[PDB]
Amino acid sequence: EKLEAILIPDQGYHQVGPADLCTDMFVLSVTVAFATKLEQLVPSTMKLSAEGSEFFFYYSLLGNDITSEPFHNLLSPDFEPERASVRIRSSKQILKAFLSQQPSLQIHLCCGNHSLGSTDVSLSALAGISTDLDNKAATVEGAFILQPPKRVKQTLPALPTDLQPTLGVAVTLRREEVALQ
């Protein structure tokens, strides 16, 4: 059988592994912290000034559709750092194995029903460093590049440096009783 995160609807947590053996509570969280150079993902300066331009981040976390607080200033992002968390009932070994087997988290920058770009954040990398969950939280954090869904990326003017659209993301796994700190 495949390891699956099974929503327990009444209680508001996901069971991973057999419920009689995997009984500890964990929190898995995603924080979108800041962004820069997002204007490269919009082909026209004119769309930046339309007020229908309202942008947000989307991702699926263990099957949960998550959207962030909409913001308007793409050139100078104004959104607040925002965390989404899910509760998991599991065991340390089974949850670490489950996470090591998950595909990367794909975080999208959206406008309306359009994805302007996405970036991959490895949950398996987080599992790989989740080696002291009895005592410490484990966190992968960095500046992740947002890639447009186009075949060809055009850059005008072409410079020696290449500042790309970037999203600061932190993904954290911890025992529920272990403070993020």
Numbering used by the authors: 166 to 346
Paper excerpt:
Using X-ray crystallography, we show that the ciliopathy-associated centriolar protein CEP120 contains three C2 domains. CEP120, for example, plays a key role in the duplication, elongation, and maturation of centrioles, which in principle could impact the production of a functional basal body (Comartin et al., 2013, Lin et al., 2013, Mahjoub et al., 2010, Wu et al., 2014). All three C2 domains of CEP120 (C2A, C2B, and C2C) adopt the PLC δ1-like topology II and are structurally similar to each other (root-mean-square deviation [RMSD], 2.4–2.6 Å), with major differences found mainly in their loop length. Thus, the CEP120 C2 domains probably play a role as protein-protein interaction modules.
(but not from Homo sapiens [H.s.]) we obtained diffracting crystals that allowed a structure determination at a resolution of 1.6 Å. The structure revealed a β sandwich formed by two antiparallel four-stranded β sheets, a fold characteristic of C2 domains. In human CEP120, both the V194A JS and the A199P JATD mutations fall within the C2B domain. In our structure of C2B from Oreochromis niloticus, the equivalent residues (V195 and A200) point inward toward its hydrophobic core, suggesting that they play a structurally analogous role in stabilizing the C2B fold. The point mutations V194A and A199P, which cause Joubert syndrome (JS) and Jeune asphyxiating thoracic dystrophy (JATD), respectively, both reduce the thermostability of the second C2 domain by targeting residues that point toward its hydrophobic core. Our structures revealed neither complexed Ca2+ nor potential Ca2+-coordinating top loop residues or cationic β-grooves. Prime candidates for interaction interfaces in these domains are the regions defined by strands 3 and 4 at the edges of their β sandwich that constitute their most conserved parts. Strikingly, other structurally characterized C2 domains engage their binding partners using exactly the same interface. Both residues V194 and A199, targeted by the JS and JATD mutations, are located near this putative interface in CEP120 C2B and might disrupt its function as suggested by our in vitro experiments.
